[PDB]
Design a protein around this ligand. Sequence first.
Ligand SMILES: Nc1nccc(-c2c(-c3ccc(F)cc3)ncn2CC2CC2)n1
Length: 351
Amino acid sequence: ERPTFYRQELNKTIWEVPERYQNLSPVGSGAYGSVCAAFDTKTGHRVAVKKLSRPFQSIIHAKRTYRELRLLKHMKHENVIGLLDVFTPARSLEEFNDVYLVTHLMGADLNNIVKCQKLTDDHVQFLIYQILRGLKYIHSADIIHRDLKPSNLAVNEDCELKILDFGLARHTDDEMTGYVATRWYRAPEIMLNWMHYNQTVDIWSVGCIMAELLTGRTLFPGTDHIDQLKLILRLVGTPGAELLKKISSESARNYIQSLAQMPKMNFANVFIGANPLAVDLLEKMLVLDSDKRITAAQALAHAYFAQYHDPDDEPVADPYDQSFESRDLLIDEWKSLTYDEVISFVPPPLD
Ligand SMILES: Nc1nccc(-c2c(-c3ccc(F)cc3)ncn2CC2CC2)n1
């Protein structure tokens, strides 16, 4: 027996939500999901409720919808976005078509903080520590964010950070073109599709964010893919034979070999005036060869986070079954798996 829902039209959208959600008011929306803010009388939190657009209009959308629910249902870390509730007014799979997702309402992101100037080393420490702590958790479940950037990091008045907007599911093509922030935090190997990318593509992203927090400037603000690749190599140095061997495209390798070689620059002469520990860490993160990049787990142990590092308080995730990613099903099959996931949702406890 479900709760009582109440219909209501907001900005030309019908929202059927349980009574517990009161004072709904638009807070934006995307081509992916319409979002309303509201007070959840059950928990006492202000929440963000998203009504997915056309969750099952296609197999890709049906699958993406399914993937997002599984992902959100699995994330249970204080530095990662959680699912407070998921629901559908649908009384049966027969009528199942709408999916609403609820999470803590987030005010500002990392931009509404960096964009104001450089940050104190203590703040960069804390903010990066949290990104890596959640990343350790995300990576431990064999999940790759793929889209870490300031606009995807929620930050509150007490500098408490949460990672959201998981990459997987979205494919930002023609949005990675030109002078766009969406590409400035992308690892070179994934940006030019040099090889199959690993979890450290996320570590490269943290590096760009850390640097930007220290200097107050974007690290690689390329006007396009190539301009950006040049900015990167100028700092990091051109690839060696070891790395070249790993680039699977003969064209990419050919292109790369056309570039005059460059040595790695001196980071202390780049991040002038920065805590040497921050500079050191940045060197372990901003490594061209993804194989030799530092891991989230290893970074947390770095001496730069001595003030915050606590091995007993940097949990990993429960196993995350992604076998469905290979599963080949019909729209209706994804829809039903999705409905099971909605139906089976167990909310996180209160206190
Ligand atoms: N204010 C605010 N706070 C938190 C999350 C979001 C959020 C969610 C989103 C993601 C997961 C959910 F469960 C609900 C909503 N989807 C998009 N946005 C922001 C876009 C709407 C402006 N917006």
